[PDB]
Amino acid sequence: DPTLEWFLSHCHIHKYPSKSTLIHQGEKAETLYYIVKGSVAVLIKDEEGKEMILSYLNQGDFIGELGLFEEGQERSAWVRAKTACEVAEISYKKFRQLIQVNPDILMRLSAQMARRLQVTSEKVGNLAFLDLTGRIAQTLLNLAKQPDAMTHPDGMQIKITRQEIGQIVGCSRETVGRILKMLEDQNLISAHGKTIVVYG
Amino acid sequence: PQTDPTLEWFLSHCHIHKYPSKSTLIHQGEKAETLYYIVKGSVAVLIKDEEGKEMILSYLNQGDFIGELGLFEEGQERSAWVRAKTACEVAEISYKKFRQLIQVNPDILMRLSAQMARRLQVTSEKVGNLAFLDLTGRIAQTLLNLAKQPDAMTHPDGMQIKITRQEIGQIVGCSRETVGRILKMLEDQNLISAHGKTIVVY
Ligand SMILES: Nc1ncnc2c1ncn2[C@@H]1O[C@@H]2COP(=O)(O)O[C@H]2[C@H]1O
Ligand SMILES: Nc1ncnc2c1ncn2[C@@H]1O[C@@H]2COP(=O)(O)O[C@H]2[C@H]1O
Ligand SMILES: Nc1ncnc2c1ncn2[C@@H]1O[C@@H]2COP(=O)(O)O[C@H]2[C@H]1O
């Protein structure tokens, strides 16, 4: 793909080990990012520093776009590396120059913003219409319907930690524990082992 | 003072239609094949649960593109209902013709994309409020947002606003009664005065 190679040729590309922070919320935004390899988590936090994952992003994804269209904006979220990453970066000023040469690069950025806005709106619906209990339930259902969920004699099976569920949903690992139990005891699931079994 | 030549050039390739107050301009699930633009008026963007309760995702106003999320990949559906809040003049262009404008002058894309940006900051802050803010703080914050805003008013004790307990409830996600309950107690902690659809934020 010649457009992405052209584009990458004006970026500078760096490695970020697993668990490092690429973008801090409140920081001034004057650069765009792009995932050559790996995956990051876009996350937000409350007062007690509890986190919610707005989105996993993966190779081929732009990051830090939101400040590109009016100056003086702050980073809106935390981006942390989920695996080891290679991350291309370019300034808003250079990027606006690439957009003039070949506006298709803006077209591919805007395609992702659109998708991201559909996906974030779906997540507002949930937080508005489901309570925490339901959101944990739904989350497990979703993991169990992913291509990588493996098969089980009595339903579907997935390996996730109370911790990833806590981040997906906005509560602690211990609160996840209490609620898995409540879920076990209404027979929605069976969480014997670090593996969970989901049903029907 | 708030139109310009790029817009007018854009607007002149559109069919510009007038919609009454309360008409829905876009239905969720519809094949997205057309871009809209609010030449005058304001709209609510809405989603629903299986039980037909409504959540207001956003208000949009004159200047604002609508119906843009299908633009970049074909075969998509509208992700939300968009409903006229006042009487509206709204422009429409097919995606295919709009892709063509973007080649003529990419600046049209930069204006749309700016707006998608601001939309995702706002929807992301909303995701934060619903996950982390309590109901009463969410209402407190909504009142503050309406009050800080033109369409708001002026008053001896602050700004004053017009909004029923139901639209409130649709913005924060709670019933009308609960809104009424929380408004009262917000009255008691000296934060507002509330006479029906009309509120004085201090
Ligand atoms: N709802 C979301 N989904 C995916 N990515 C997001 C979302 N909200 C913010 N981001 C990304 O995280 C970045 C944080 O820095 P910026 O706001 O500059 O740019 C932001 C977007 O790239
Ligand atoms: N979170 C949001 N904030 C503002 N506008 C939105 C949001 N989600 C959807 N929309 C608008 O609602 C429109 C519904 O149809 P589209 O998905 O074609 O285009 C959508 C966007 O313009
Ligand atoms: N838990 C909830 N989540 C989201 N929206 C709600 C909830 N309860 C009520 N609403 C919506 O917000 C509206 C506020 O006024 P009503 O109670 O008339 O109708 C309400 C619903 O349409």
Author numbering:
A (entry chain B): 9 to 208
B (entry chain A): 6 to 207
Text lifted from the article:
CAP is a 210-amino-acid transcription factor that binds cAMP generated by adenylyl cyclase in response to the phosphorylated form of Enzyme IIAGlc (phosphorylated in response to the phosphoenolpyruvate-carbohydrate phosphotransferase system). cAMP-bound CAP regulates the transcription of over 100 genes crucial for carbon utilization through its binding to a specific promoter region and recruitment of RNA polymerase. Previous studies of the ligand binding domain of CAP demonstrated negative cooperativity between cAMP binding sites in the absence of structural change within this domain. We produce coarse-grained models that describe global low-frequency protein backbone motions of CAP and show a strong correlation between negative cooperativity for cAMP and modulation of the delocalised normal modes on ligand binding without a requirement for a spatially distinct physical pathway or conformational change. We demonstrate experimentally that altered connectivity between backbone elements in CAP can give predictable alterations to cooperativity for cAMP binding through altered mode amplitudes.
